[PDB]
Every structure is written in structure tokens, then in C-alpha cells.
Amino acid sequence: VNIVDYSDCFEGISGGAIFCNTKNKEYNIYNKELIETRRSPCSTFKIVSTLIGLEKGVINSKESVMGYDGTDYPNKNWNKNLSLEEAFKESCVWYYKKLINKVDAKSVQNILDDLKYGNCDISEWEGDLKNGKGHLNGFWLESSLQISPKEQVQTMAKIFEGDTNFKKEHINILRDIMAIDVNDANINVYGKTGTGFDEKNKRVDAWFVGMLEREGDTYYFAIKSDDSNKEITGPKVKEIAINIIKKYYS
Numbered sequence: 001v002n003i004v005d006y007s008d009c010f011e012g013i014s015g016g017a018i019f020c021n022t023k024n025k026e027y028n029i030y031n032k033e034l035i036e037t038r039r040s041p042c043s044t045f046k047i048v049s050t051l052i053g054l055e056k057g058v059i060n061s062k063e064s065v066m067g068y069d070g071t072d073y074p075n076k077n078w079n080k081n082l083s084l085e086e087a088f089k090e091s092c093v094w095y096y097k098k099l100i101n102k103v104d105a106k107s108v109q110n111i112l113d114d115l116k117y118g119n120c121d122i123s124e125w126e127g128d129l130k131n132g133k134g135h136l137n138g139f140w141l142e143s144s145l146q147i148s149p150k151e152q153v154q155t156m157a158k159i160f161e162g163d164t165n166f167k168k169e170h171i172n173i174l175r176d177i178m179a180i181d182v183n184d185a186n187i188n189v190y191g192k193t194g195t196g197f198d199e200k201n202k203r204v205d206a207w208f209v210g211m212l213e214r215e216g217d218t219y220y221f222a223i224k225s226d227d228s229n230k231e232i233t234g235p236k237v238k239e240i241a242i243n244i245i246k247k248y249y250s
């Protein structure tokens with residue numbers, strides 16, 4: 001366990017980072033207090049909800065559809081019968097809400113327990129209804145479910161090292177749709193952003209969680225901001241993450 005200083009890459013934004021290589025068990029941690037603090041995963045939960053949907057047969061491939069019903073949305077790309085691959089990359093909330101609402105709560109509880117997914121608290125299934133957004137809500141979006149950056153990395157490692165019961169075929173679908181283009185062919189980067197605002201503490205929950213492959217070595221990582229500036233989003237934290245990878249993990 002090395003405590004490290006990635007602060008230059010955060011360019012003044014409050015946050016932390018953790019990178020873990022399970023072959024030689026080197027944990028690199030920036031801002032240990034934050035890295036151990038549980039927070040809502042927001043859209044990073046789509047990593048796990050994709051696997052849940054595949055395991056239960058709600059979806060079957062990166063092509064699979066959820067039966068778009070014509071509802072109007074402001075994001076152009078949500079207004080179509082999009083595939084799993086597209087819904088993941090667009091972070092399409094209606095697709096993943098429809099997916100998860102086809103699965104019984106006990107099945108979800110037992111999967112989260114098996115993954116040690118933070119507090120595994122799905123008690124507020126419908127999510128943070130006080131924000132007014134109705135069905136565009138769920139337990140994983142600033143609601144009952146909370147996970148620390150360290151636990152995210154531990155979960156990613158268990159999934160992608162083959163240490164869960166999820167089918168290898170399903171793991172590989174998730175790998176395919178998480179792949180990121182970082183304009184450097186010598187590293188393979190995979191991940192998912194997440195964006196929320198913690199109304200109680202007036203801080204963002206801005207995430208980028210995933211994995212890095214670089215010549216035999218694999219690092220599992222989680223980068224997280226808790227800044228008070230509402231302009232700090234998951235996509236912004238992904239840029240920070242990419243800068244860290246390029247500076248320190250190349």
C-alpha cells in the first residue's frame with residue numbers, strides 16, 4: 001500500500017484515486033480518507049446491472065434491446081430502440097431502469113451480497129423520488145445504495161479476474177462495451193463514468209471506475225471527486241483519470 005500524490009492531475013478539484021494490481025498486490029492510494037468513504041455509485045452501477053440483466057436473461061448480447069416505447073427524451077440518442085452497447089455508452093437511464101425492474105429484489109440483493117457491493121442496501125428501490133424525476137430514479141442514483149472507491153476496485157477485480165459466478169461470455173460482453181479510446185495503443189482502458197449530486201452534503205459524486213491493461217499488468221481503479229462545484233461531472237473525472245494513467249501508468 002503506497003500513499004501517493006496525484007493532486008497535480010486533479011488541477012485543484014477535490015477528490016481521490018485508487019489503483020490496484022492484484023498480481024503483486026500493489027495498492028496506490030491518493031486521499032485515503034475519501035477512498036474509504038461510501039457514496040452512491042450513480043451510473044457506475046451500470047457495470048453491475050448489465051451483468052445482472054445478462055445473468056437473468058433480460059438481455060443476451062451487446063445487441064440486445066429493451067423495447068423502446070416512443071417516450072420523448074431531451075437526449076436525441078435515448079429516443080430509439082437502442083442496443084445494450086449504445087445504452088451503456090449513452091448511459092441511458094430508461095433502458096437500465098426497465099432492465100432492472102424486470103428482476104426480483106431478492107435476486108438483486110443476493111448478487112450484491114455476493115459481490116460485497118458496498119452497503120448492499122436496495123431498500124429504496126424506487127430511488128430518490130424527492131428530486132421530482134419520477135421513474136428516472138433508482139436505488140443506485142443518490143439513494144440507498146452506497147459503495148466506497150476501494151470497494152468499487154475490489155468488485156471490479158473480482159468480476160474481471162474471473163472470481164465470480166458470472167458467465168465468462170457475459171464478462172466479455174461487459175469488457176467490450178466498457179472499452180475506452182485513450183489515443184494510446186499501448187494501454188487498454190475500460191471504464192464507466194457516474195454523475196450525481198449529494199444534496200445533503202452539497203457535494204458532487206463524480207466517478208470514473210474501471211480497469212487498465214498494460215503489458216501483462218492489470219490495474220483496477222476508481223477515481224472520485226466530492227467537490228462542491230456542481231460543474232464537476234463523471235466525464236470531467238474521466239479526463240483526470242486518463243491524465244493519471246498517462247502520467248503514472250504508462
Ligand SMILES: *C(=O)N1C[C@H](NOS(=O)(=O)O)CC[C@H]1C(N)=O
Nearest residue numbers: 042043044091193194195234235
Ligand atoms: C448516471 O450517473 N447518470 C445517468 C447519466 N450518465 O451520467 S455520466 O455522463 O456521468 O455517465 C446522467 C447523469 C446520471 C443521472 N442523473 O441519472
